[PDB]
């Protein structure tokens, strides 16, 4: 306290030519004037700016994405001290991702006791070659002064001492000689010595009192300091704040009312940021990290045993997350009391991170507008997502909205999860490639009917590519082998004994025991799952058949679990009641069988009489294993080794571990006798060149033939 003028904190500048003309009284800046989103600032308007004078600068400086700025030399005259209190990338000054800073102020800097200066991307910038180097920077090694016009040996270092004015320019020593060091074209720098840089120096005498810094009225008094490196308060200085006053970066003490009760008053009626500012780490902060909860009545953050959750109240109760990092922003916040809109564009399967983060985000108390979920085809990958409240209702009085969304084909599964609906109606429409009874199960688990309308939700379309088969099937018999496995299931057919046209077997590699039900994008062969068709069975007699519906499958490696099932080739019609069925996903383990061949066989050893063999398995995790057959009895005493490689030949056998009698290479890689086992499905075409309908066109056609052949030969009389 006890300062003249307006002690003004900082504020940002954005998207305009100049907004410094308003400043006509601020003589002290405690904040840091930031520049943001200045993609089109021209230099000509910055040649003149307004600022009365300066006592000191408290916070760091960060300059970013500015096109103009031929002159920033009118803002901070009469400088006394500058330091980065807060540190963006640990540096006192950060010039990065901007252009053409021809001139700037800061022409009487005395000391920066913490934080170096980084300069980058300044095609125009001069007079940084004739300034004090070590007298101003506390950390000379972290100094990054580069990419300046004078630094390119192109800008003449015109400075005072030759033809400019006088601005209290003493001659300081950095290289033995008392140099008339400068900062810009028409200014000179006042710099304190390095000896007492932690105490401050003044023209009124020697180095100031130890509590002072930069400049002081008189030495040997904490009160006389205008700037104290120790805690300043009410005119005086002290090493530590009283418990009634919380600390501020070794420099100030402030009453608890400005941290605790300042922000608790406002929930949605104050434009300052109402985050319940607490005190931890001996400092006032908006909120503390995870593992540190709130326990006291005063709402001071205190540690809790291990990591602990965070209940976060965000500004406006709305946050549209548009990226995986946009969700990591709210990482640690286990419960969010507001809307979390998803409009995420781009990315490639990084949403596993969301399963770590959104898999903890349980509640979304606001309207749920979610779309553009490209990464997760299925919404069943969040282990905490149960509560959806309507405290904020969007247009239509709905608490949920996902309309005409693309790149999605599934939702959250209730086999290992659940969700509840609250506060009014809900709208779900136009997300094709997904069955509709799953939404009915969603309504059933949610409960509280009347607010679950069967006319405001899709029950009319968006499911004519994944038929909802009411019935389900099993595997009555499964006779397996290393790959050849005959699966035989129930002979149940539809009421019509020709509408069913085979069975669509679905399978994939899945050692895990948790899988959803989906199908990746289509590129004529490429798909996350694998699917194939099986011919329909044959009728034998009315009461029962002597040949069950069976199918022999190959390609599956032994020892391996596959999340396999089947569906029925159903002819599309206007009623799904009489469709077929689908088996449940079984993680069927192909039996541990002799074609198990480990890979990456590495022979290592800690000695010559030892070989600590190690490997990796292709698909055999050794769960059912009992022992390993391994050979060390001599089986390389071969006549090929005893009768080969005369020294007259070139050195080729040395540095080898492969010799003729141990060879099992194929005679020819071409498919001749038994290499035809790799004969697989079409991968230029999915299965066949003609897509599915041309087959159905035939199938139903035969029916409309046969029935047409029947309807003429029967019904002799109505009576």
């Amino acid at each position: 306290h006890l300062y003249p003028g307006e002690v003004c904190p900082g504020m940002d500048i954005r998207n305009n030519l100049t907004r410094l003309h308003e400043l006509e009284n601020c003589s002290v800046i405690e904040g840091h004037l930031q520049i943001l989103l200045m993609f089109k600032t021209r230099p000509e308007d910055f040649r003149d700016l307004s600022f009365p004078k300066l006592i000191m600068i408290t916070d760091y400086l960060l300059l970013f994405r500015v096109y103009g700025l031929e002159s920033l030399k009118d803002l901070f005259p009469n400088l006394t001290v500058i330091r980065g209190s807060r540190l963006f990338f640990n540096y006192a000054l950060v010039i990065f991702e901007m252009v053409h800073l021809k001139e700037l102020g800061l022409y009487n800097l005395m000391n920066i006791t913490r934080g170096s200066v980084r300069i980058e991307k300044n095609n125009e910038l001069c007079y940084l070659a004739t300034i004090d180097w070590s007298r101003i920077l506390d950390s000379v090694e972290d100094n990054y002064i580069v990419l300046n016009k004078d630094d390119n040996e192109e800008c003449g270092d015109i400075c005072p001492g030759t033809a400019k004015g006088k601005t209290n320019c003493p001659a300081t020593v950095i290289n033995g000689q008392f140099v008339e060091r400068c900062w810009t074209h028409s200014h000179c720098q006042k710099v304190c010595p390095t000896i007492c840089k932690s105490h401050g120096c003044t023209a009124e005498g020697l180095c100031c009192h130890s509590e002072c810094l930069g400049n002081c009225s008189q030495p040997d008094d904490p009160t006389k300091c205008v700037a104290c490196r120790n805690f300043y308060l009410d005119g005086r200085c002290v090493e530590t704040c009283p418990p009634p006053y919380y600390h501020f970066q070794d420099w100030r003490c402030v009453n608890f009312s400005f941290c605790q009760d300042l922000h608790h008053k406002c929930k949605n009626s104050r434009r300052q940021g109402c985050h319940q500012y607490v005190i931890h780490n001996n400092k006032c902060i908006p909120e503390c990290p995870s593992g540190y909860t709130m326990n006291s009545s005063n709402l001071l953050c205190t540690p809790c045993l291990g990591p602990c959750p965070k209940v976060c109240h965000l500004l406006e109760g709305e946050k549209t997350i548009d990226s995986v990092t946009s969700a990591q922003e709210l990482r640690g916040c286990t419960v969010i009391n507001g809307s979390l809109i998803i409009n995420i564009r781009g990315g490639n399967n990084l949403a596993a991170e969301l399963e770590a983060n959104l898999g903890l985000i349980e509640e979304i108390s606001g309207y749920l507008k979610i779309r553009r979920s490209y990464a997760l085809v299925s919404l069943s990958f969040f282990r905490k997502l149960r509560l959806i409240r309507g405290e904020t209702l969007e247009i239509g009085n709905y608490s949920f909205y996902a309309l005409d969304n693309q790149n999605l084909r599934q939702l959250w599964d209730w086999s290992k999860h659940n969700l509840t609906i609250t506060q009014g109606k809900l709208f779900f429409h136009y997300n094709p490639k997904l069955c509709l009874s799953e939404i009915h199960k969603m309504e059933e688990v949610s409960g509280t009917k009347g607010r679950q309308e069967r006319n405001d939700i899709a029950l009319k379309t968006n499911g004519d590519q994944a038929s909802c088969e009411n019935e389900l099937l099993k595997f009555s018999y499964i006779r397996t082998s290393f790959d050849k496995i005959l699966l035989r299931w129930e002979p149940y057919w539809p009421p019509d004994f020709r509408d069913l046209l085979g069975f669509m077997l679905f399978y994939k590699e899945a050692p895990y025991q948790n899988v959803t039900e989906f199908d990746g994008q289509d590129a004529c062969g490429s798909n996350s799952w694998t699917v194939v068709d099986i011919d329909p069975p044959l009728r034998s007699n009315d009461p029962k058949s002597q040949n069950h519906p069976g199918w022999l499958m190959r390609g599956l490696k032994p020892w391996t679990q596959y999340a396999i099932f089947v569906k029925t080739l159903v002819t599309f019609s206007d009623e799904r009641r009489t469709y077929g069925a689908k088996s449940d996903i079984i993680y069927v383990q192909t039996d541990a069988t002799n074609p198990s061949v480990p890979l990456d066989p590495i022979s290592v050893s800690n000695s010559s009489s030892q070989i600590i063999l190690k490997w990796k398995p292709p698909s055999d995790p050794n769960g059912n294993i009992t022992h390993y057959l391994v050979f060390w009895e001599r089986q390389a005493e071969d006549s090929e080794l005893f009768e080969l490689d005369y020294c007259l030949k070139g050195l080729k056998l040395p540095s080898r571990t492969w010799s003729p009698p141990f060879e099992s290479e194929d005679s020819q890689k071409h498919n001749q006798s038994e290499y035809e086992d790799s004969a697989g499905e079409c991968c230029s075409c999915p299965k066949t060149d003609s897509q599915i309908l041309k087959e159905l066109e035939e199938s139903s056609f035969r029916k409309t033939f046969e029935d047409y052949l029947h309807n003429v030969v029967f019904v002799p009389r109505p009576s």
């Binding site: 019509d496 029935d707 029947h710 309807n711 029967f714 019904v715 002799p716 009389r717």
Partner: peptide
Amino acid sequence: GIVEQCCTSICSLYQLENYCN
């Protein structure tokens, strides 16, 4: 047609013995 009583809702005895002796 015969289908009109057997490729559809329940096909009972009368739906079959409409022309036998």
